[PDB]
């Protein structure tokens, strides 16, 4: 049950093991496999990553891999990823973003397809297309176009993309994290405006906070996080709804995540603006999409520029890294996450089990310096014990091909064992 280390300690034994047989190995050294995504649910997972030529940008990719698989016991006393099906996205050369959801022991991929890589800066969603690609271990993949024409929205959104590290299945409804674009300032910022930081001499805090939500490449557009709820009758009569995130503690649009864990629904939002601390919380209401935001004072992320690690004050900033979290104990408010132990550079990944107020324990992945652009983590019960699987967007071989890495580890049964 809930018998594991719940105290501050050193030298944890995560029994860390790398998994190499899941992610394919590309023969071309010039191809960069980037932006991995992984979502685990009910013993099955969905893995996604992008392949590009001499460039690791997501939409700048000629192939997008979609893998479905299962968690299997090999008598090893630890979970193994068993790859069942592997297909390439039929519209890979036009993929702007994708989000994985493992529903009913099957894989579902929600992607945004466009002819224009800059569609989010100069276009609208009527000019683009959105698809659901779904398959499992036996059935051939089928791709259905999402009828955004028949979509209902809670605000005057002009654009949107599925952006995040994973989604959620609730009954007949899919709930996918999404980033929307709107061209008017309809927002309030009590949280940002309440900070007592030095006021920069050009503008005031209300202006600073309004403008910090703007797109950095279209001074006229604003990026707001939200969710998309898609209900349907066995791929029939789609009903699509687009709801924005709560205006309490707004942060610039960024890839998020929804996860089914411990009887709860956990929302995560990558911190790509001035508030560099963990934005995460369990879902209270669905309209408006209100996650109960944490007061985490120990988990941050690196970034260059005016908002490095542990930066708090409001400032017109853009940049950051995606680092999923996974809850371990609801009563003790414990979570685990692979974060980057650096102030400005994206390197030195560390498995970190933490409080909202204190870091409980941590361990470096590699003894040598390791480049890591993003991490995702999912935890689950296996043989009545808590195990976790993380995917790291690594670049250990600089100059050669890039390929993410998968690690499996266990929450320590006892504290301080080495």
């Amino acid at each position: 049950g809930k018998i594991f280390c719940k105290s501050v300690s050193k030298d944890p034994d995560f029994r860390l093991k790398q998994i190499d047989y899941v992610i394919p190995v590309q023969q071309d050294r010039s191809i960069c496999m980037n932006n991995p995504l992984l979502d685990i649910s009910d013993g099955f997972f969905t893995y996604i990553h992008y392949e590009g030529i001499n460039s690791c940008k997501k939409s700048d990719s000629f192939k997008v891999l979609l893998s479905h698989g299962e968690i299997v016991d090999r008598g090893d006393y630890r979970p193994s990823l068993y790859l069942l099906s592997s297909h390439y996205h039929p519209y890979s050369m036009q993929v702007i973003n994708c989000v994985p959801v493992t529903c009913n022991q099957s894989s579902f991929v929600f992607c945004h397809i466009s002819n224009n890589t800059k569609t989010l800066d100069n276009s609208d969603y009527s000019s683009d297309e959105y698809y659901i690609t779904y398959f499992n271990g036996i059935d051939r993949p089928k791709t259905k176009k999402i009828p955004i024409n028949n979509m209902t929205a809670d605000n005057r959104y002009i654009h949107f993309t599925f952006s995040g590290g994973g989604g959620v299945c609730l009954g007949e409804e899919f709930i996918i994290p999404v980033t929307t674009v709107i061209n008017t300032d309809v927002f309030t910022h009590d949280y940002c405006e309440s900070f007592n930081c030095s006021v920069q001499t050009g503008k005031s805090l209300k202006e600073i906070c309004s403008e910090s939500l703007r797109s950095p490449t279209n001074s006229s557009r604003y990026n707001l996080n939200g969710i998309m709820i898609i209900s349907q009758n066995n791929m029939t009569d789609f009903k699509i709804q687009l709801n924005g995130i709560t205006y309490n503690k707004l942060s610039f649009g960024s890839p998020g995540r929804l996860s089914k864990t411990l009887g709860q629904v956990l929302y995560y939002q990558s911190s790509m603006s001035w508030d560099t601390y963990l934005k995460a919380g369990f879902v209270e209401k669905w309209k408006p999409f209100t996650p109960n935001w944490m007061n985490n004072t120990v988990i941050s992320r690196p970034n260059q520029g005016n908002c490095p690690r542990y930066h708090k004050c409001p400032e017109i900033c853009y940049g950051g890294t995606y680092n999923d979290i996974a809850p371990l104990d609801l009563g003790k408010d414990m979570y685990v996450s692979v974060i980057l132990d650096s102030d400005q550079l994206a390197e030195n990944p560390e498995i970190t089990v933490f409080n909202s107020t204190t870091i409980l324990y941590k361990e470096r992945v590699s003894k040598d310096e390791l480049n890591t652009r993003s991490t995702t983590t999912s935890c689950f019960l296996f043989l009545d014990e808590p195990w976790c699987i993380s995917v790291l967007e690594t670049n250990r071989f600089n100059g050669k091909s890039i390929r993410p890495e998968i690690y499996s580890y266990k929450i320590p049964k006892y504290c301080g064992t080495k």
């Binding site: 390197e347 652009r373 890039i402």
Partner: protein
């Protein structure tokens, strides 16, 4: 590690015609310190853009160039660490790779009035451009 580059009009490394050229190898660190409050109180405010060679010659930036780092605070020693790895925590990826060129400039007027002036500025007046040909 490399010698950090203080970004101020009072730095000799900015050659009057060639800017500041650096030949960093992959895996090198490089700080770009924007100056503290100088002794003579000449407040220095800039806004740096990661740019392309053509518009680095023309010294003009459109909306697409991303504000790499801005020298907002005069008192706080604002800085900018760079490791020439491929993956970077910046918006728009910014892959470094090898045997490429990477140009960093500012189009701003010395003070905060022209902080976001993108037309001309220091790129041509003082030629404070950082050019980094990795390799060789």
């Amino acid at each position: 590690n490399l010698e950090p580059v203080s970004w101020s009009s009072l730095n000799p490394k900015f050659l009057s015609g060639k800017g500041l050229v650096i030949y960093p190898k992959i895996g090198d660190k490089l700080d770009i310190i924007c100056p503290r409050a100088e002794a003579g109180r000449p407040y220095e405010y800039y806004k740096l853009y990661l740019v392309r060679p053509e518009q680095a010659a023309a010294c003009s930036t459109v909306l697409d160039p991303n504000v790499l780092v801005t020298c907002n605070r005069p008192e706080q020693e604002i800085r900018f660490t760079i490791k020439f790895q491929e993956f970077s925590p910046n918006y728009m990826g910014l892959e470094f790779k090898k045997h490429h060129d990477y140009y960093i400039t500012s189009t701003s007027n010395g003070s905060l009035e022209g902080l976001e002036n993108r037309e001309g500025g220091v790129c041509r007046t003082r030629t404070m451009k950082i050019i980094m040909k990795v390799g060789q």
